[PDB]
Amino acid sequence: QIVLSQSPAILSASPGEKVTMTCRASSSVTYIHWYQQKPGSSPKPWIQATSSLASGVPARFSGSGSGTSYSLSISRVEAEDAATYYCQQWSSNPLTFGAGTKLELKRADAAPTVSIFPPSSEQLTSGGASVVCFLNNFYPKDINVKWKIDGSERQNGVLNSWTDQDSKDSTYSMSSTLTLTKDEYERHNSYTCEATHKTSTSPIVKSFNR
Amino acid sequence: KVIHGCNFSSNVSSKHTFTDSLDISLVDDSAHISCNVHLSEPKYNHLVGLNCPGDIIPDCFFQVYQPESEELEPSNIVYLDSQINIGDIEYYEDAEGDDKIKLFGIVGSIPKTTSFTCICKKDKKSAYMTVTIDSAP
Amino acid sequence: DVKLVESGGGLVKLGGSLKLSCAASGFTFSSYYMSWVRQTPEKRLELVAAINNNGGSTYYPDTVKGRFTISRDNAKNTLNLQMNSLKSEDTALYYCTRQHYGNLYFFDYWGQGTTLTVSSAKTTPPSVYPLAPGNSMVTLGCLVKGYFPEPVTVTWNSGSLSSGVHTFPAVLESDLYTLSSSVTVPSSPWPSETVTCNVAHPASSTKVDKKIVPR
Numbered sequence: 379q380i381v382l383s384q385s386p387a388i389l390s391a392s393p394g395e396k397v398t399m400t401c402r403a404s405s406s407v408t409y410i411h412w413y414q415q416k417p418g419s420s421p422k423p424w425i426q427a428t429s430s431l432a433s434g435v436p437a438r439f440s441g442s443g444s445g446t447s448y449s450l451s452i453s454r455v456e457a458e459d460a461a462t463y464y465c466q467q468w469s470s471n472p473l474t475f476g477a478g479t480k481l482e483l484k485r486a487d488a489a490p491t492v493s494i495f496p497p498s499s500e501q502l503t504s505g506g507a508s509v510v511c512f513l514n515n516f517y518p519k520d521i522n523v524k525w526k527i528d529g530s531e532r533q534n535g536v537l538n539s540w541t542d543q544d545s546k547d548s549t550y551s552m553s554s555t556l557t558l559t560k561d562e563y564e565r566h567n568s569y570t571c572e573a574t575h576k577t578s579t580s581p582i583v584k585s586f587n588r
Numbered sequence: 589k590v591i592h593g594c595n596f597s598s599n600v601s602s603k604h605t606f607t608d609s610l611d612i613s614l615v616d617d618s619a620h621i622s623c624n625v626h627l628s629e630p631k632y633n634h635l636v637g638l639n640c641p642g643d644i645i646p647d648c649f650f651q652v653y654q655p656e657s658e659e660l661e662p663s664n665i666v667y668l669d670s671q672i673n674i675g676d677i678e679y680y681e682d683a684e685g686d687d688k689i690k691l692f693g694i695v696g697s698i699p700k701t702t703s704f705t706c707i708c709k710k711d712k713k714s715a716y717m718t719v720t721i722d723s724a725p
Numbered sequence: 726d727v728k729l730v731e732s733g734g735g736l737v738k739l740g741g742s743l744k745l746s747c748a749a750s751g752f753t754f755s756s757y758y759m760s761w762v763r764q765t766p767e768k769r770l771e772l773v774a775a776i777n778n779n780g781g782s783t784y785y786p787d788t789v790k791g792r793f794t795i796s797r798d799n800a801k802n803t804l805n806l807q808m809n810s811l812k813s814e815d816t817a818l819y820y821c822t823r824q825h826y827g828n829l830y831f832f833d834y835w836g837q838g839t840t841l842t843v844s845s846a847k848t849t850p851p852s853v854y855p856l857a858p859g860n861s862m863v864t865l866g867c868l869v870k871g872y873f874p875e876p877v878t879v880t881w882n883s884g885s886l887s888s889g890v891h892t893f894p895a896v897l898e899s900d901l902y903t904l905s906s907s908v909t910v911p912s913s914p915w916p917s918e919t920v921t922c923n924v925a926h927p928a929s930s931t932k933v934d935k936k937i938v939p940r
Binding site: 409411413419420421422423426427432462464466468471472473474475477478491493494495496497498500501504508510512514537538539540541551552553555557586587 | 768769770771772775784786820828829830831832833834835836837838852853854855856857858859862864866868870891893894895896898903904905907909940
């Protein structure tokens with residue numbers, strides 16, 4: 379019932395930066411605990427009872443707050459700090475957590491590499507047709523994909539998937555699939571996936587003709 | 589004057605004397621051991637406190653931690669002034685090397701019997717003092 | 726060392742029941758409060774059930790109250806979670822974690838978790854479709870569609886093609902999963918040299934190799 383709102387959802391930082399993430403409660407809480415989680419493992423104790431660091435947590439971390447507003451700060455970010463930080467309260471039942479703030483490492487802006495793929499002959503024999511669009515190795519995370527069949531927009535039948543930030547190059551990738559029946563796919567001729575990213579005001583357009 | 593409370597430090601050349609002691613440096617890593625203090629008088633003229641060689645949670649004794657519920661219910665951090673409900677509490681702090689001494693002084697009766705807690709951490713070791721102060725019969 | 730090891734997770738039909746267990750070691754189990762905390766696919770953490778040190782008091786949020794029962798056996802150092810009338814929204818990674826009154830109820834140790842998947846879908850092998858273009862670098866793909874349950878492993882050229890590969894997280898589509906995998910190679914080795922995606926789905930004992938040929 380007590381809602382903990384963590385902001386920002388994604389904290390982009392370069393190593394060396396001083397950063398702060400906030401935990402705002404819907405009603406007053408008498409303390410906040412913080413936990414750190416990295417992909418592949420469980421949450422770990424990080425800050426106990428608002429400001430007391432857990433064992434082994436480096437001195438660059440600190441926690442503060444009271445009432446409805448708490449925070450976690452890093453005096454100088456290190457690459458190993460890239461993780462999700464969760465805040466947690468237990469001032470009334472039920473005990474609740476925030477949705478997490480993911481501390482993400484910055485890199486130079488990179489435009490996505492867009493590839494469009496028609497449905498395979500194998501899929502067409504089964505009565506279906508999936509048009510796939512890959513938007514690879516881009517930065518920052520925010521991106522938009524628009525599907526156009528013969529110039530007209532289409533929203534239904536689109537499923538999207540996003541990778542986590544790459545551990546080696548710090549980029550993100552996205553997959554977009556438009557699923558149609560074989561009959562629906564054969565009514566039209568041109569298929570287009572449009573990629574809107576902050577790296578350019580003009581979207582990257584990839585198309586094919588059936 | 590004796591301090592009714594817990595000395596969690598391992599030092600003997602201190603200027604503060606505590607009624608109870610629990611050497612936190614000898615508690616296991618990842619353990620949470622209690623040191624229980626109980627005051628029972630019609631009228632008090634007492635010092636209550638702790639000596640902790642590490643972090644103290646919460647900001648004792650201006651703030652204290654509520655006693656443990658018998659039901660599955662949380663314990664919150666509260667102000668000691670409102671917990672024991674007396675308006676003239678005196679607070680004191682001291683430090684001896686890495687040891688931190690936090691005390692409060694109480695004079696007179698307490699309206700209702702009350703309990704509260706203070707937590708001491710040192711590295712991976714932890715101990716906590718629970719205090720009960722009785723109201724007049 | 727303090728250790729918490731969960732077990733019992735698996736696939737359960739809608740409305741089904743399942744029992745989770747957690748083996749605790751390396752500490753005085755009976756001195757700590759124990760809880761089951763789940764992590765949803767969107768990475769939200771939610772308390773499911775809490776029990777005090779002696780087992781006399783429990784708490785459940787309204788999302789699972791009446792359906793779930795937490796218990797502990799302080800003679801065996803075990804924590805159990807009996808889950809009845811399971812719903813699709815109960816699909817999550819379930820962690821066993823401890824707290825103490827004397828640490829201000831801080832979850833200072835957690836297990837690795839046990840996965841629960843609630844679905845009435847049957848085990849289905851995947852359909853593997855090649856993704857070929859209809860430039861200096863060519864991007865090829867592998868569309869893996871309509872399988873259940875997760876996971877599917879995707880490699881390229883039996884693992885020798887490791888650079889320039891991204892496998893996208895699976896999405897739910899008609900109660901079955903669908904994912905794609907991307908591979909980037911120069912224009913010179915393709916189609917001059919073979920590029921094949923190897924998809925394994927251990928739940929249905931299936932392995933499919935799909936060679937990518939030009940359209």
